[PDB]
Design a protein around this ligand. Sequence first.
Ligand SMILES: *[C@@H]1O[C@H](CO)[C@@H](O[C@@H]2O[C@H](CO)[C@@H](O[C@@H]3O[C@H](CO[C@H]4O[C@H](CO)[C@@H](O)[C@H](O)[C@@H]4O)[C@@H](O)[C@H](O[C@H]4O[C@H](CO)[C@@H](O)[C@H](O)[C@@H]4O)[C@@H]3O)[C@H](O)[C@H]2NC(C)=O)[C@H](O)[C@H]1NC(C)=O
Ligand SMILES: *[C@@H]1O[C@H](CO)[C@@H](O)[C@H](O)[C@H]1NC(C)=O
Ligand SMILES: *[C@@H]1O[C@H](CO)[C@@H](O)[C@H](O)[C@H]1NC(C)=O
Ligand SMILES: *[C@@H]1O[C@H](CO)[C@@H](O)[C@H](O)[C@H]1NC(C)=O
Lengths: 418, 418
Amino acid sequence: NQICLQKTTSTILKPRLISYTLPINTREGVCITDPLLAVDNGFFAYSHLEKIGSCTRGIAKQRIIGVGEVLDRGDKVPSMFMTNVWTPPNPSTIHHCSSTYHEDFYYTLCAVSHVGDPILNSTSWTESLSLIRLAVRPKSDSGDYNQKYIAITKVERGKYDKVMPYGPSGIKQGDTLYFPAVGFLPRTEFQYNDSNCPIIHCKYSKAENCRLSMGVNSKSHYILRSGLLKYNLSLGGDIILQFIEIADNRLTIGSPSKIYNSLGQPVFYQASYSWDTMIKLGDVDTVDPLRVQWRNNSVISRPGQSQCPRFNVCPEVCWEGTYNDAFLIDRLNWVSAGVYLNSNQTAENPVFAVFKDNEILYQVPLAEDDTNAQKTITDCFLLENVIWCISLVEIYDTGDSVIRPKLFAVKIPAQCSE
Amino acid sequence: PNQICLQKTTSTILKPRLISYTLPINTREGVCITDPLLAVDNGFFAYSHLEKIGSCTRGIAKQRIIGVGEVLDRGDKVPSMFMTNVWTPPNPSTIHHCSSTYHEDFYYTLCAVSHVGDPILNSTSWTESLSLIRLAVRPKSDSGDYNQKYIAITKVERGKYDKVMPYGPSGIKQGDTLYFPAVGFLPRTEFQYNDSNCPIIHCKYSKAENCRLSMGVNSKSHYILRSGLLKYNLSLGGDIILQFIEIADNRLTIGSPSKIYNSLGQPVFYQASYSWDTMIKLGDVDTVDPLRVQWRNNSVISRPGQSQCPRFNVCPEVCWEGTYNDAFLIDRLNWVSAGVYLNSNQTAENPVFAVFKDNEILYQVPLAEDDTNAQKTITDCFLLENVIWCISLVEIYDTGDSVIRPKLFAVKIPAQCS
Ligand SMILES: *[C@@H]1O[C@H](CO)[C@@H](O[C@@H]2O[C@H](CO)[C@@H](O[C@@H]3O[C@H](CO[C@H]4O[C@H](CO)[C@@H](O)[C@H](O)[C@@H]4O)[C@@H](O)[C@H](O[C@H]4O[C@H](CO)[C@@H](O)[C@H](O)[C@@H]4O)[C@@H]3O)[C@H](O)[C@H]2NC(C)=O)[C@H](O)[C@H]1NC(C)=O
Ligand SMILES: *[C@@H]1O[C@H](CO)[C@@H](O)[C@H](O)[C@H]1NC(C)=O
Ligand SMILES: *[C@@H]1O[C@H](CO)[C@@H](O)[C@H](O)[C@H]1NC(C)=O
Ligand SMILES: *[C@@H]1O[C@H](CO)[C@@H](O)[C@H](O)[C@H]1NC(C)=O
C-alpha cells in the first residue's frame, strides 16, 4: 500500500459525508457539543452533549456515549452503525470523556463534577471518575456484558493532587489500557528552571513566561501536566488507575491529547493550548515513562486570540487554542492526515490536509472560508488496501435547529494523477 | 449457664455507657456522618459511614470509609473498640447500601455502586453494579491482597428478579458460605399475590388490594421489593457468583433493611417495618434457603411512622414509612431480645434501649432525651467473659454540632433483678 507522496495543488482529495446512525429524536433548538470519536479495528465510539439553546450557554439535556461498527457495503465508502448507547442520568456532571478499545468492549473514562468544568474550577472540584464498559457487538439478556459500570478501587496520582481524563481516545498494550489524562500539581510544588525557557531568540519574552504559562492563569493555584491514566485489566477485581506524566521535552500546559497506534508503534498528539502553537505530534518513545518524539513540524498550527496567535513560537503567558489532531499514515515519510483551521485568530475554515514536517502535500477545504469550526478528531484506517480517514468536525452557529458535528470520510489517494 | 433478669422492673437496672471507639482522625468542620453500619462478630467489628460536607441529606459526599477492628476489654471492665484496617473508596458518592459479614480472618462487605443515587428511590434508573471488599481484621506487614482486596462479583444469579442489591447492615456465615441481607426488584406485572390473603378481618377502612400495593415504594411503583439473602459460597471461590434467596410469604412486607445473625447456636432474622406491619419482625430462621422466618407474636415494640401507618398500626394500608431499629436475641428459652427503639407515634425521637419479651417490656432505659432526633439503630450483643454485653449504634441528627456523628453505646444486661 502506497499513497500520493508528491505536492499537488489539484483536488485529488474528495471528502464525503459519512453515513452514521444515532438514536432518533424530534427535539429542536438544540446544539450537539463536547464531541468524541474513536475508531479502532473496524469499530467506533461516539459521545456528545445535547444542549437546549446555544452551544455555549444552552442547558444540558442529554449525554450519550455510544459504540458501533465501521463497515464497507460495496459502495466502497465507509459507513457507521451504532450498536450500543448509554445515557448517564445527570448530563451536567459528566465531563472530559475518553474512550479506549479492548477485546470486545470500549472503555470510556469520564469525569464527574458538581462545580462545573473541572479545569476552570480546579480548586473547587473534588476528584471523581467513572468508567463505562460498552460492548461493540451486543447480545441478549447477558447481564453486565452489554453495559457494565466499573468502580475505581484506587487512584494512584503520585505527587499530583487530582487527575482527570483529558482527551478523546487512548491505546491498549496487551491487557493494559492507557487513557489521555492531565494532572493537577500545585504551583508551589512545581520544579522548573527558568533557564530552560527558550527565550534565546525572543525579545519581549521573559524567562518566567514558560513556567507561568503552565497554568490556566499566571497566579493559578495549580499547574496542568498532560499524561496517561493506566488501567491494568489483568489485575483482578482491583480497578486501579495510575497516572503517568509526560516529560519535559517540549513541555506545555496540560491540554487535551490523544494517544493512538499506527503502523505498529504508538503515536501521541497534544493540543497546542499555549505559546508553542505549532503542532505537537510524534512517536511515543516510551509509554511508561511517557516520552514523545515530537516532530520538527513547521507548517501546521492552530488558531489563537491576541497574545498567542497562530504561528507564534515565542514564550508568552496565554491559554488559547483548539484541539485539531492528526493521524500518521506513513512512518518512513512521516506523512500525517488531519483537519486544521485556516485562520490566524478565529476558529474558522476547516481544511483536511495530508501534510509533512515541512510540507503540506495536498489539502482540501471541508467547508467555506468563513465557516465556524472548532474541535476536530481524525482517525484513519486501512479498508482493503486504501487508507480511509474519518474526521469529526465541530461546526457552530450554522443557524439551524439541530446544529450537529459534521462527520467526514476522506480516502487518501494512491496516485497523484486526476 | 449465663443468666439474665427475667422480671419487669421500673427501676434503672440498665445503665448505658458511651463506648470508646477509634476512627481515623480529621479536623474538618460542617460535616455529617451518615449511612452508618455496625457489625460485631467473634470479638471483631466492622464500621462504615459516609462523610457529608454540609447537610445530612443534601450535602456533598466527602469521605466513605470502611473499617474493621477488635472488640476487647482493656481492664476498664467495659467493651472497647479499636480499628485495625480501613479503606476509603475514591468516589464516595457511588457507594450505597453496604453490608458486612465475617468469616475466618476477614470481614467481607458487599456494597452497591450507583450513579443515580439511592437505588431504592431511583429503582428504574439504577444499573445493577456491586462491590465486595475483603478486609483483614488483623492486618500484616506489606501483605497486599491479604489486607485489602476487591472480589469482582463477576456473576449474579438473580433468578426471576431483575435487580438485586445488598440491603441490610450485617449477615452470617454457615461453614464457608456467606449470606448477606438483600432485596429483590420484581416488576409488578410478574408479582404473584392473592389479595384474599391481605388480613382485613378487623380493619373496616382497609381494602384487600392495600397489601399488594404496599409492597412497593408507591402503589404504581414499577418494582415491588422483596427482602432476602444474597449468597456467596467461598469453597468454590474462583469466579465468584452471587445468588439471591427470597423470603417466604409468611407475614410478607415490603423489602426493608434486614439483618441475619447467629445467637445461641441458631440463626435469627430481623426485617424493618417499612409498611403497615408496624410491629417488630423478629424470629428464628427455620431454613436459610429457602428463607423461612418464624416471626414472633411481639405486641410491645413498634417503630415511628407518619399519618398513614403510625406506630402500633396493624391494619393494611398503602404506606412506605418506618425506621430501622433492630434487636438481638439474648435468651431463647424465654425469647428475650435487646435493642433500641424510638418512643414516638409519628416522629424519629426518644431512643430507648429495651430488653423485652414477646408481650412484655421487662426493663428499658432512655438513651438521649425525649426530643433528640434519632433514626437508625444497629444493636449487636455478645458475651465478654460471662457477662452479656450489647453495643448499639444510634443515628443522632439535628443539633448543629460542627461534627454530627452517630452515638455508640455499651450496655450490660442485668443478670439479677435489682
Ligand atoms: C527535531 O529537530 C532536532 C534538531 O533541531 C533533531 O535532532 C537533531 O538531529 C541532528 C542530526 O539530524 C543532530 O545534529 C548532530 O549534532 C552533533 C553534535 O552537535 C549538536 O550537539 C547538541 C546535541 O549533542 C545539539 O543540541 C547541538 O545543537 C548540535 O547540533 C554533531 O556532531 C552531528 O554531526 C555529525 O553528523 C553531521 C551530519 O552528517 C556531520 O556533518 C558531522 O561531521 C558529524 O558526523 C550532527 O550535526 C542534533 O544534535 C539533534 N538535536 C538534538 C537536540 O538531539 C530531531 O531529530 C528532530 N526530530 C524529528 C522527529 O524530526
Ligand atoms: C498487569 O497485572 C498483571 C497481574 O499482576 C501483570 O502480570 C502485568 O504485568 C501487569 N501489567 C502492567 C503493570 O502493565
Ligand atoms: C498570521 O500571523 C503571521 C505572523 O507571523 C503572519 O505572517 C501571517 O501572514 C498571518 N496569517 C494571516 C492569514 O493573516
Ligand atoms: C401512640 O399510639 C397508641 C396507639 O395508637 C396510643 O394508644 C398512644 O396514646 C399513642 N401515643 C401518643 C402520645 O399519642
